[PDB]
């Protein structure tokens, strides 16, 4: 009796035990709480109010079987890769503001519309995000990046040996000028010489760094590998 009574007349500062809803109210330890709601419990035993949540993105529409993950591509470029129904969404968040960059529509079918995938990323030279649904083929989202410097003062830049950007468009490619995204760039690819001209970049000074990030999606097809022998 003495232990319990002295403890209950004592200062209760060791409240680090957190929530305990299994024990009877008679048997709840003095370090625990029978009801915690929106309270953060510190290692030292201090109980404070939790911080709120900030809405960074909002949109309207039917969403089922959704998933989100964080990603960083070949250069230091951070994105949020999400699956929403049949579609893949690419987000970029800056100062609690999330902007939808690319929307790959109808990646999956109606059977995997409501299916949550198992997602993993690869740290390759050309990184990719692998989505696995139990009813559809595995999908990969591949990021291909190139970097260049600006040689003249103008609104256009030229990427040499840009053989990986044959199908570069607004729905596939993003352009960064000094780490700032370009809203509406224009792409023109030359077949004869491997050169991609990107215009409508704005005011580009000599020495500015232009980064080209193409995001594509593919599915995994069954195959067999053999040597000629």
């Amino acid at each position: 009796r003495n232990n319990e009574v002295a403890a209950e007349q004592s200062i209760q500062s060791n409240n680090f035990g957190g929530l305990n809803t299994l024990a009877s109210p008679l048997n709840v330890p003095y370090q625990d709480s029978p009801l915690l709601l929106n309270t953060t419990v510190d290692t030292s035993g201090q109980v404070y109010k939790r911080k709120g949540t900030r809405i960074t993105y909002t949109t309207t529409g039917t969403s089922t079987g959704c998933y989100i993950t964080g990603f960083t591509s070949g250069l230091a470029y951070q994105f949020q890769v999400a699956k929403r129904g049949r579609d893949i969404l690419l987000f970029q968040t800056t100062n609690d503001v999330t902007s939808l960059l690319l929307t790959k529509s109808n990646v999956w079918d109606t059977r995997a519309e409501a299916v949550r995938p198992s997602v993993v990323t690869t740290s390759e030279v050309t990184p990719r995000v692998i989505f696995a649904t139990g009813v559809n083929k595995p999908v990969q989202l591949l990021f291909v990046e190139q970097q260049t410097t600006q040689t003249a003062n103008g609104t256009s830049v030229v990427f040499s040996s840009a053989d990986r950007f044959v199908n570069a468009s607004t729905a596939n490619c993003l352009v960064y000028v000094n780490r700032v995204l370009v809203s509406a760039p224009s792409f023109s690819y030359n077949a004869g010489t491997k050169q991609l001209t990107v215009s409508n970049l704005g005011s580009t000074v000599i020495g500015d760094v232009i980064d080209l990030v193409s995001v594509t999606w593919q599915w995994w097809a069954e195959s067999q590998f053999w040597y000629g022998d």
Binding site: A23, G52, Q78, T93, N95
Partner: protein
């Protein structure tokens, strides 16, 4: 984890260890760890100290044994057992999720309830060092599809979740991305510059009933109403 590969099957845990060599066709040995399985692929996390997973009865970490070095499972959610157990119906198996917040050394558990088959409704926060549990609750519920850790281009490492606030015939009608640990102490914070337009609000926490003259008691919480806009009430009856 720890030179081993843990295969968590719905009713068991298996370990694959290559020994001093890699795991190859001639170097696979499968060890039976426990008969306590996992819910889904999104209920496994690695913290700074252990590996945690969500089963039907609670949350378990995988830790080695002193006796022979083999691995076993220890229940971390022993104090909140009554909060678990909805997931033994197959319809609720895909909803729950687990995420690791390394900035605060926390584990976020999104867990569903009976009557909500779209997403998980409750969020339980696990402080890793003291092995402690708490609950994050908001009006109309934290209907979360998935939570991950991302990097804002200005603010640094952060934690974000995908939610819906409006429901259309049992189907979510909006898609919202939110960030935890905001600068204010209110939920679903929205910032806007005033241009003479109006400001959209989220769903008001309320429940609706059709009164029957022979019934005088009406539920208010989600456990008794099964309504999406149900909120939690102050347990003090004089408030």
């Amino acid at each position: 984890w720890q030179s081993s590969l843990f295969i968590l099957t719905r009713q068991a845990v298996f370990r694959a260890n290559g020994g001093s060599s890699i795991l190859s066709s001639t170097n696979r040995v499968i060890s039976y760890v426990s008969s306590n399985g996992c819910t889904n692929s999104r209920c496994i996390v690695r913290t700074d100290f252990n590996v945690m997973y969500l089963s039907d009865t609670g949350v378990y970490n995988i830790n080695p044994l002193v006796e022979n070095g083999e691995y076993t499972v220890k229940e971390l959610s022993i104090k909140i057992r009554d909060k678990f157990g909805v997931t033994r119906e197959p319809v609720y198996e895909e909803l729950p999720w687990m995420a690791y917040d390394s900035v605060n050394k926390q584990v976020l558990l999104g867990y569903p309830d009976v009557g909500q088959t779209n997403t998980s409704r409750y969020v339980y926060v696990y402080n890793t060092y003291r092995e402690s549990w708490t609950e994050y609750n908001t009006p109309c519920g934290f209907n979360i599809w998935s939570t991950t850790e991302y990097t804002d281009r200005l603010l640094g490492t952060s934690v974000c979740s995908i939610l819906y606030t409006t429901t259309s015939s049992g189907t979510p009608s909006n898609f919202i991305i939110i960030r935890w640990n905001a600068s204010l102490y209110i939920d679903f914070i929205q910032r806007k510059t005033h241009n003479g337009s109006s400001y959209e609000l989220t769903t008001q926490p309320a429940v609706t009933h059709t009164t029957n003259v022979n019934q005088r008691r009406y539920g208010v919480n989600f456990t008794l109403t099964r309504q999406n806009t149900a909120f939690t009430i102050n347990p003090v009856t004089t408030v």
